[PDB]
Amino acid sequence: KKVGLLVMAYGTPYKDEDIERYYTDIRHGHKPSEEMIADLRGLYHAIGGLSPLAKITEAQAYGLEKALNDSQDEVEFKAYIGLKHIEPFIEDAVEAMHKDGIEEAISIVLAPHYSSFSVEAYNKRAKEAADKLGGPRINAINDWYKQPKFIQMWADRINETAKQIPADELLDTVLIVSAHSLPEKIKQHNDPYPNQLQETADFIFEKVVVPHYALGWQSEGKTGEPWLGPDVQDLTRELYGREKYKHFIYTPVGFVAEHLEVLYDNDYECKVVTDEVGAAYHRPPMPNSDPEFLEVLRTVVWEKYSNLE
Numbered sequence: 001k002k003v004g005l006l007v008m009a010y011g012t013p014y015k016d017e018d019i020e021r022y023y024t025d026i027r028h029g030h031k032p033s034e035e036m037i038a039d040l041r042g043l044y045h046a047i048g049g050l051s052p053l054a055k056i057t058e059a060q061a062y063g064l065e066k067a068l069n070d071s072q073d074e075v076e077f078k079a080y081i082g083l084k085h086i087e088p089f090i091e092d093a094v095e096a097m098h099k100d101g102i103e104e105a106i107s108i109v110l111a112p113h114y115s116s117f118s119v120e121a122y123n124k125r126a127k128e129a130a131d132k133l134g135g136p137r138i139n140a141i142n143d144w145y146k147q148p149k150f151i152q153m154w155a156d157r158i159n160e161t162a163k164q165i166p167a168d169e170l171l172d173t174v175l176i177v178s179a180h181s182l183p184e185k186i187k188q189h190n191d192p193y194p195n196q197l198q199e200t201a202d203f204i205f206e207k208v209v210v211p212h213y214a215l216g217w218q219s220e221g222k223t224g225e226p227w228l229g230p231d232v233q234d235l236t237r238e239l240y241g242r243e244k245y246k247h248f249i250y251t252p253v254g255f256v257a258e259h260l261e262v263l264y265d266n267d268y269e270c271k272v273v274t275d276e277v278g279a280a281y282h283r284p285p286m287p288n289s290d291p292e293f294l295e296v297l298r299t300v301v302w303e304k305y306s307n308l309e
């Protein structure tokens with residue numbers, strides 16, 4: 001019997017025509033304004049027409065499927081992609097595991113940190129799917145940022161970029177660690193999310209040559225409601241104002257692929273700020289389908305299966 005690997009991710013439009021139904025799914029049934037759509041289309045057209053996230057996510061899931069199976073002869077994993085706001089939806093993927101006869105599955109979200117607005121939404125949807133059909137049994141991974149190979153991978157990348165900065169200027173360099181912002185209300189109820197990213201920033205900092213680091217947030221929502229701060233653009237200005245850093249190294253470690261939230265929020269917005277103040281901009285490559293990142297996920301999944309009992 002095969003074991004299902006439910007790999008979950010946010011989803012990205014495949015075509016310009018998908019944008020509206022995508023935006024509406026994101027807005028939970030509320031249809032965006034025609035101008036709103038326009039702006040989103042403009043964003044996607046800034047980064048090069050559409051996001052590579054669709055092909056990256058597939059490489060990541062079928063790369064992990066392959067990596068798990070090539071490293072053992074006890075089980076055969078079958079990977080099923082379940083996106084959040086576009087097809088193949090989470091529910092489509094569970095329905096497929098049922099049809100194919102999967103009895104047990106291990107679900108993983110391509111987002112190392114847990115939050116009530118992200119990972120918890122994925123897992124509730126997949127398990128509500130699994131219960132209506134009566135199969136497969138889904139054993140969910142909730143977070144994997146504490147994985148040593150995960151921390152070492154980012155530290156190695158940051159150190160690669162750092163060595164390419166003049167040593168006389170490395171003391172004027174700062175590492176910005178960030179993730180998707182969320183409505184600050186999550187802290188009222190003890191969400192581990194903000195604390196998990198502080199741990200990720202600390203774990204990495206100890207393993208890099210960059211002498212300074214700060215935690216930031218990106219893609220904050222327009223809701224009048226407060227959101228987790230500071231924003232990476234405001235933090236860059238605040239940091240340059242107090243310390244006059246020459247180099248800014250951005251690591252959006254809450255993400256695992258070069259998609260819109262990285263290519264826009266960092267590679268364009270943060271870069272604008274550094275140019276305005278006169279600082280340099282650095283952004284290490286994201287994990288994407290790199291064999292090291294796939295080995296991180298293979299170890300994450302092979303440990304969940306070992307401790308499944």
Ligand SMILES: CC1=C(CCC(=O)O)c2cc3nc(cc4[nH]c(cc5[nH]c(cc1n2)c(C)c5CCC(=O)O)c(CCC(=O)O)c4C)C(CCC(=O)O)=C3C
Nearest residue numbers: 009010011012013026027051053111118180221259260261
């Ligand atoms: C926690 C989190 C992650 C990380 C974990 C995970 O991966 O799940 C993430 C990832 C991503 N978010 C993405 C894109 C978008 N997120 C939006 C809107 C929102 N995201 C939110 C949360 C998150 N999002 C929230 C609270 C909203 C508010 C919507 C509402 O009003 O209820 C919107 C709408 C317009 C806008 O405001 O930007 C878009 C287009 C893409 C795809 C990029 C591409 O296509 O390449 C990716 C990987």
